[PDB]
Amino acid sequence: EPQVLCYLTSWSSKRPSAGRFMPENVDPTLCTHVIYAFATLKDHKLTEADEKDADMYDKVVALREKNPNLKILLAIGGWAFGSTPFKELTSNVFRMNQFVYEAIEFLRDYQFNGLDVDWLYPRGADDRAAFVSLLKELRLAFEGEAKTSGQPRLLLTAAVPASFEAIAAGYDVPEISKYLDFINVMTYDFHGQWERQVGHNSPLFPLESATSYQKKLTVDYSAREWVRQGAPKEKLMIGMPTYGRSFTLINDTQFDIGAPASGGGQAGRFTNEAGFMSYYEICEFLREDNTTLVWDNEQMVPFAYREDQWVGFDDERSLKTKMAWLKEEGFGGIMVWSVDMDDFRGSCGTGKYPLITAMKQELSGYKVKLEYDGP
Ligand SMILES: *[C@@H]1O[C@H](CO)[C@@H](O)[C@H](O)[C@H]1NC(C)=O
Secondary structure: OOEEEEEEEHHHHHOOHHHOOOHHHOOOOOOOEEEEEEEEEOOOOEEOOOHHHHHHHHHHOOOOOOOOOOEEEEEEEOOOOOOHHHHHHOOOHHHHHHHHHHHHHHHHHHOOOEEEEEOOOOOOHHHHHHHHHHHHHHHHHHHHHHHHOOOOOOEEEEEEEOOHHHHHHHOOHHHHHHHOOEEEEEOOOOOOOOOOEOOOOOOOOOOOOOOOOHHHOOHHHHHHHHHHOOOOHHHEEEEEEOEEEEEEEOOOOOOOOOOEEEEOOOOOOOOOOOOEEEHHHHHHHHOOOOOEEEEEOOOOEEEEEEOOEEEEOOOHHHHHHHHHHHHHHOOOEEEEEOHHHOOOOOOOOOOOOHHHHHHHHHHOOOOOOOOOOOO
16 A cells, blocks of 8 residues: 655656656656646636646646556645745635635546645744644545545645654644645755755765754654654655755865855756756766765765765665665655656666656555554
8 A cells, every 4th residue: 555646847848858748758657646736826726827737737637548546636836836825825714715615626627636735834823723724624625525526535635844843833743634645745855055065865864973953854854753743654655856956066075975065066957957956867967977976874875976066866776775764664655756857768777767666666565554663
């Protein structure tokens, strides 16, 4: 019963040349769920973010025609979106409920299998309560619709932060765990171009020399914080990045964890964002001349540097290491950000979709089983 939820980013279709990704590029057998990101709120109603999206919806659905057990979800929100439309969505009950009732129709019309809520992020007591009510209402209406109609219930999932501080700030974990089908923990973006020291995007474990605060910025500590706060393991989907985060070094001779950095490193040719690289862009950086590939034995993740360019990322080995940690802890499955940034063309020299394949094969035979695991 382990689940693999893969995000598909709409804007990946705007990629140039090989980087261009369409719903048809998705292997219908890789993931258990596909989540399309993002839809938006216009007049407090679940709505297309762009007319080009309507047909995109039609194409991400009907991946079901090559795999009928594949579930397709639509995500609302995201970072660009902001926290304000969610505050106004949950300000009064009518708009809230009318949002739910019409969202159900919207989803059923497109024949989605459910909804992913990406409010990034609720903050403060009033936001906490409103996030719970939104989730509660969606869940009860999904159940209620499943009985007043005829078909199996729409799925409810949400993307949630890894930061232990953001958890306390915005998430009543026992309550949201009642109504969510899956809790997608964003166990990445622990470090990046907003910092002036080199650090890894998604380290599994911390360095022994790390401060007590730095030790909390890991996949292992974050996932366990969610458990500690009451999230049920079988609903916890641990996030796996198919991308890396890069730095421009102050000094070429200092390339170790914590070396000074002036900002993000040179953008990739396809994602066009400094401080950021997709995995197939990582490989291009890796086969350049004189690039040093390093394996961090403590953090159990790779990184690489060449001249003043430094990038920390995830490969086959780190993701396999993570699946072993996953099974050991007994989590319900994984979430992948994102399917369009795996090497979906096989240009790395390994197989097509190498990162997700490596995770899938390592989860083979795994079945989630709940058991007491101490304080
Ligand atoms: C780079 O680092 C070394 C010591 O690690 C320092 O002596 C050197 O001056 C630095 N380079 C520059 C241009 O400052």
